[PDB]
Amino acid sequence: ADTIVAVELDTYPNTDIGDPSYPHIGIDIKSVRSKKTAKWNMQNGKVGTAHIIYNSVDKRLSAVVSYPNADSATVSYDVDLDNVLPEWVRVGLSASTGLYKETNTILSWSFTSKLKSNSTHETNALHFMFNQFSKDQKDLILQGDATTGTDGNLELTRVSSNGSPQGSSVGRALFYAPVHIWESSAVVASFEATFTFLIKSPDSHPADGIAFFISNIDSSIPSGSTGRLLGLFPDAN
Amino acid sequence: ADTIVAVELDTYPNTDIGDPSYPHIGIDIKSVRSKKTAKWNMQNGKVGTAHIIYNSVDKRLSAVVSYPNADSATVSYDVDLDNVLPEWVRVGLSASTGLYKETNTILSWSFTSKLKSNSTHETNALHFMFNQFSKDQKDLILQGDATTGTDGNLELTRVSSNGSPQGSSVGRALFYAPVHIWESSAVVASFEATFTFLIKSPDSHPADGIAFFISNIDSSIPSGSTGRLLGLFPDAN
Amino acid sequence: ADTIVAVELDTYPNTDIGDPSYPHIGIDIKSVRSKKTAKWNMQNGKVGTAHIIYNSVDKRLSAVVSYPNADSATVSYDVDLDNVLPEWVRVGLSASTGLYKETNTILSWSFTSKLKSNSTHETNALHFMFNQFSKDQKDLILQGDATTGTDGNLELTRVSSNGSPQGSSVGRALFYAPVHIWESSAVVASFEATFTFLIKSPDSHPADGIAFFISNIDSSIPSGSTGRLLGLFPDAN
Amino acid sequence: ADTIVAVELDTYPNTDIGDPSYPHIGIDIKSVRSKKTAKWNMQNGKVGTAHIIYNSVDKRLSAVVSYPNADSATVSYDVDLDNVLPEWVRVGLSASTGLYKETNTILSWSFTSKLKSNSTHETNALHFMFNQFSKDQKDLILQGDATTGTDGNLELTRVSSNGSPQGSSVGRALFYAPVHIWESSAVVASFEATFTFLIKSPDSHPADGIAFFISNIDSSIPSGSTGRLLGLFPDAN
Numbered sequence: 001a002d003t004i005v006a007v008e009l010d011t012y013p014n015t016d017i018g019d020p021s022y023p024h025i026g027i028d029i030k031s032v033r034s035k036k037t038a039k040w041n042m043q044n045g046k047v048g049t050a051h052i053i054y055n056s057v058d059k060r061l062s063a064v065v066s067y068p069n070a071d072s073a074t075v076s077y078d079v080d081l082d083n084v085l086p087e088w089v090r091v092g093l094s095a096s097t098g099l100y101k102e103t104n105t106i107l108s109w110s111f112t113s114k115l116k117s118n119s120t121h122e123t124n125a126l127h128f129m130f131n132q133f134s135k136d137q138k139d140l141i142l143q144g145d146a147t148t149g150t151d152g153n154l155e156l157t158r159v160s161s162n163g164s165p166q167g168s169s170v171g172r173a174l175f176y177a178p179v180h181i182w183e184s185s186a187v188v189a190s191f192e193a194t195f196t197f198l199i200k201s202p203d204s205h206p207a208d209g210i211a212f213f214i215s216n217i218d219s220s221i222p223s224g225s226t227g228r229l230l231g232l233f234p235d236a237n
Numbered sequence: 238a239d240t241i242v243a244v245e246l247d248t249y250p251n252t253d254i255g256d257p258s259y260p261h262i263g264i265d266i267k268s269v270r271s272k273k274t275a276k277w278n279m280q281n282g283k284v285g286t287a288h289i290i291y292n293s294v295d296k297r298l299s300a301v302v303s304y305p306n307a308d309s310a311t312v313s314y315d316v317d318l319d320n321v322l323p324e325w326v327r328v329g330l331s332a333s334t335g336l337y338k339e340t341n342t343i344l345s346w347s348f349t350s351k352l353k354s355n356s357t358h359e360t361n362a363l364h365f366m367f368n369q370f371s372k373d374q375k376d377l378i379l380q381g382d383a384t385t386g387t388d389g390n391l392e393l394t395r396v397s398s399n400g401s402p403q404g405s406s407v408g409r410a411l412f413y414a415p416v417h418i419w420e421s422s423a424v425v426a427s428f429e430a431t432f433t434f435l436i437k438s439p440d441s442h443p444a445d446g447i448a449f450f451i452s453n454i455d456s457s458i459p460s461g462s463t464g465r466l467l468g469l470f471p472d473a474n
Numbered sequence: 475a476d477t478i479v480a481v482e483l484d485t486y487p488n489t490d491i492g493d494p495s496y497p498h499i500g501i502d503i504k505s506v507r508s509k510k511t512a513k514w515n516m517q518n519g520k521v522g523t524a525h526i527i528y529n530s531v532d533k534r535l536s537a538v539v540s541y542p543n544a545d546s547a548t549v550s551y552d553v554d555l556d557n558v559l560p561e562w563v564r565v566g567l568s569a570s571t572g573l574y575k576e577t578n579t580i581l582s583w584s585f586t587s588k589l590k591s592n593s594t595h596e597t598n599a600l601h602f603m604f605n606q607f608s609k610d611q612k613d614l615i616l617q618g619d620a621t622t623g624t625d626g627n628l629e630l631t632r633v634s635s636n637g638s639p640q641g642s643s644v645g646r647a648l649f650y651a652p653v654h655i656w657e658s659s660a661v662v663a664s665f666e667a668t669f670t671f672l673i674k675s676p677d678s679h680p681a682d683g684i685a686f687f688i689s690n691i692d693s694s695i696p697s698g699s700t701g702r703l704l705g706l707f708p709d710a711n
Numbered sequence: 712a713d714t715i716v717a718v719e720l721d722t723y724p725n726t727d728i729g730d731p732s733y734p735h736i737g738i739d740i741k742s743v744r745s746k747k748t749a750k751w752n753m754q755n756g757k758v759g760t761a762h763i764i765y766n767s768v769d770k771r772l773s774a775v776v777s778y779p780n781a782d783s784a785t786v787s788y789d790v791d792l793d794n795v796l797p798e799w800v801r802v803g804l805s806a807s808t809g810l811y812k813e814t815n816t817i818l819s820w821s822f823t824s825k826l827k828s829n830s831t832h833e834t835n836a837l838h839f840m841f842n843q844f845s846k847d848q849k850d851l852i853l854q855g856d857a858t859t860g861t862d863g864n865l866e867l868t869r870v871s872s873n874g875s876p877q878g879s880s881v882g883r884a885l886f887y888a889p890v891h892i893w894e895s896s897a898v899v900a901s902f903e904a905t906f907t908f909l910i911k912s913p914d915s916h917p918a919d920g921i922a923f924f925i926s927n928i929d930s931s932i933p934s935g936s937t938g939r940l941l942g943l944f945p946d947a948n
């Protein structure tokens with residue numbers, strides 16, 4: 001019953017529910033079955049960067065994921081957010097593990113959104129930038145197994161003291177302030193988000209992924225959304 | 238009980254409790270009795286601009302209020318905010334009326350805070366900008382008589398359908414997200430705020446004024462803070 | 475000989491050389507014959523706003539022109555600018571008049587360009603903002619009849635002491651610093667520009683229009699570019 | 712005959728011309744004999760960061776220099792730039808060697824300046840950010856021995872192929888666009904600059920230093936300004 005728009009960094013192929021058979025990035029509009037995907041050549045244990053852009057002139061959502069010294073993977077999709085999301089939203093990061101597992105570490109996150117009235121041609125804007133997360137990060141709403149402050153990082157899913165990821169974990173971090181995403185079909189916010197992430201797995205099989213998401217302001221982790229549902233969806237429809 | 242740092246635009250001289258005998262701007266550190274003031278040549282019914290700045294290098298809090306084509310009033314005070322404020326705060330705008338009254342209309346409000354930590358030398362930052370306020374402004378916490386949306390403005394205190402301000406009114410607006418305002422592990426910490434305001438009075442004499450304030454995150458309007466205490470303080474100590 | 479990418483606000487239909495039979499906005503890639511146009515419901519004597527955006531992810535150049543309380547006109551074109559422009563460029567504003575005329579008054583101009591390089595993932599950036607122009611605006615290179623300082627504005631084309639625009643006029647303003655607009659070693663490259671403009675005509679018909687352009691750094695007004703060529707092109711090829 | 716305001720990072724004590732007897736940071740107003748200094752505990756071969764701020768409300772120039780995991784050195788000085796500098800300036804970085812020597816490597820440089828008319832309460836602003844310098848850095852004016860592009864860095868003074876600094880070297884880098892620093896005593900720009908630097912010396916005696924400076928737009932390296940004059944002054948008056 002939540003409304004979700006997300007960019008997923010999907011590390012585990014769930015072909016039974018429409019994943020491609022390889023790690024991929026995807027654009028999810030109200031469904032874990034991505035509207036568009038691109039192959040992702042994941043590098044275990046290297047810091048990656050994700051960049052997400054929504055152009056309100058073209059109403060086009062795009063995402064680029066890359067590592068230093070490697071090609072990027074890119075995916076783009078036409079979507080009118082004014083016709084999918086409520087007027088006010090929260091933005092967040094989500095991750096999960098299932099039978100297989102991985103660290104889901106966020107080293108930094110920034111976000112910018114601008115909403116320009118055509119009434120006044122003046123602009124409301126929100127910008128935030130995390131380059132360090134503290135043990136008491138009061139401007140984040142943490143959900144599930146998410147924690148902050150270990151080495152200054154945000155750990156979205158559970159990691160034991162020895163440093164090993166745990167399976168069957170789900171966690172999210174939403175920015176405290178709601179975001180005004182649209183006022184009309186003619187007035188929709190432009191925004192961009194960037195985060196750096198570190199996904200490590202002991203097994204040859206990391207799972208399940210990280211996502212940047214946009215939700216209704218009161219969104220919470222859906223029941224049974226560990227594993228392939230990325231902490232985002234109550235089912236695989 | 239609340240911890241308050243404020244810049245006041247004090248329109249009504251309460252000489253009983255330390256006010257000079259003229260409209261003034263003042264720096265308030267945990268008391269309504271300002272640590273420093275400057276005379277403010279108030280112009281009834283003209284849009285004004287207030288600019289507030291602090292950086293941890295000067296450790297100097299300053300404010301400027303001005304109108305188009307007029308001399309500005311400036312006030313400064315040396316103060317070490319990490320010894321005054323809690324680490325996490327909320328920021329906001331407050332206003333009140335008493336026996337005498339005025340409109341306390343906010344046309345725009347922006348704020349930036351930056352924390353640059355001591356050895357990664359990276360930056361945590363928050364920036365917001367309101368050039369319009371709507372009737373359901375979800376990124377603002379409204380307290381007391383504050384309302385939004387009438388002509389796209391924020392009305393801190395009660396105004397009738399006439400456009401007529403009311404006495405004994407008090408209202409505040411706080412930005413939804415807490416702000417990490419200092420960290421004793423930061424090379425530089427700094428913030429700045431700007432707002433534009435319209436204060437109209439039918440009377441010979443406007444009252445009581447507008448303040449930008451910084452507070453503990455769970456700050457609420459103190460009992461008995463209408464009038465001269467500007468919705469900020471429980472008493473005049 | 476110059477290399478030009480421009481967004482034109484074309485006020486005068488030159489159907490002889492490919493213009494539609496109405497005022498329009500167009501995307502120009504190395505020719506005055508626009509790759510894409512949209513109809514522009516011009517309002518004589520009202521302040522307009524133009525917004526131009528490009529990012530290397532969409533590789534899509536878009537522009538929007540609008541007035542307060544009116545439908546905006548939008549035009550977009552898929553284009554790979556690293557295959558069109560030199561690596562270093564200057565950015566600027568151009569305008570002209572011909573047999574018919576108009577004022578080509580710029581009230582404000584801002585621009586941001588960002589280059590994020592492929593493996594440090596760091597950012598090189600330039601941002602400037604003009605909300606006032608003075609008589610000796612040293613960060614602008616003025617060409618032809620362009621002047622600054624009259625009522626704090628930039629007059630791209632010749633206006634008499636009357637406030638009366640003149641025919642056969644051409645003028646440009648380029649920002650002093652060259653811009654590193656693409657690097658084939660960048661993850662993301664992007665820019666955006668905004669300006670506000672006032673076009674007044676005594677005539678039935680205004681001419682000839684205003685453009686935001688991107689050029690080789692040593693770009694100058696081509697011989698014979700007054701009127702329909704907007705001070706941008708040597709011919710109508 | 713140039714007019715110079717600078718923040719110096721002075722690595723070599725020239726006590727004969729008023730240096731303190733230890734490495735220091737200083738604020739120089741039209742003279743190499745700093746108006747104010749603070750002791751600087753320099754770390755050979757570690758990347759340092761310099762942050763410079765001018766507060767136009769207080770008219771106070773401050774500078775902080777630090778290394779990761781170390782205390783910072785700070786210096787502040789009251790100076791009305793409207794009464795010292797011309798209305799338009801260039802900003803730059805300078806360095807020199809003399810009998811003794813050091814690498815004077817710049818790894819990054821950013822600058823922001825805002826000038827707000829009280830006529831319109833609107834703002835002109837310039838921001839630039841270098842996180843990488845290329846071999847052909849067209850938005851920098853290089854003077855003397857300064858070069859760019861080696862490992863993506865700006866080398867202000869001469870370094871041989873083996874990597875060893877050379878004595879008797881002087882070089883500067885000015886940003887291409889002039890900067891509007893003041894319009895009146897009531898209208899002066901606020902600005903801030905940051906750069907990271909790497910000073911290495913083979914000998915126990917590094918010399919002579921790096922400076923952030925503000926000059927007349929046509930400033931050039933003064934004759935005989937190698938060594939203790941930091942490429943800034945024609946003499947030691």
Ligand SMILES: OCc1cn([C@H]2O[C@H](CO)[C@@H](O)[C@H](O)[C@@H]2O)nn1
Pocket residue numbers: 012014097098099100101207208226227228229
């Ligand atoms: O291998 C068959 C199988 C897998 N799973 C589990 O592991 C997967 C990877 O962690 C998850 O995608 C999935 O949701 C489930 O938790 N349950 N059965």
Ligand SMILES: OCc1cn([C@H]2O[C@H](CO)[C@@H](O)[C@H](O)[C@@H]2O)nn1
Pocket residue numbers: 249251334335336337338444445463464465466
């Ligand atoms: O004149 C007697 C008198 C009245 N008040 C009232 O009105 C003042 C102006 O609004 C307020 O400052 C004050 O707090 C009180 O409400 N204070 N003293």
Ligand SMILES: OCc1cn([C@H]2O[C@H](CO)[C@@H](O)[C@H](O)[C@@H]2O)nn1
Pocket residue numbers: 486488571572573574575681682700701702703
């Ligand atoms: O009507 C005949 C005619 C006149 N012109 C002139 O005026 C036009 C409108 O200003 C310009 O577009 C054109 O380039 C020329 O200067 N072009 N055709």
Ligand SMILES: OCc1cn([C@H]2O[C@H](CO)[C@@H](O)[C@H](O)[C@@H]2O)nn1
Pocket residue numbers: 723725808809810811812918919937938939940
């Ligand atoms: O040691 C005495 C002496 C020094 N210098 C030289 O070396 C110094 C350090 O490089 C410079 O400060 C000085 O300007 C000069 O070049 N000339 N004589």
Ligand SMILES: [Mn+2]
Pocket residue numbers: 010011012013014019208228
């Ligand atoms: Mn999956």
Ligand SMILES: [Mn+2]
Pocket residue numbers: 008010019020024026032034
């Ligand atoms: Mn998937």
Ligand SMILES: [Mn+2]
Pocket residue numbers: 247248249250251256445465
């Ligand atoms: Mn008072």
Ligand SMILES: [Mn+2]
Pocket residue numbers: 245247256257263269271
């Ligand atoms: Mn007072």
Ligand SMILES: [Mn+2]
Pocket residue numbers: 484485486487488493682702
């Ligand atoms: Mn035309």
Ligand SMILES: [Mn+2]
Pocket residue numbers: 482484493494500506508
């Ligand atoms: Mn045309």
Ligand SMILES: [Mn+2]
Pocket residue numbers: 721722723724725730919939
């Ligand atoms: Mn010296």
Ligand SMILES: [Mn+2]
Pocket residue numbers: 719721730731735737743745
């Ligand atoms: Mn010195």
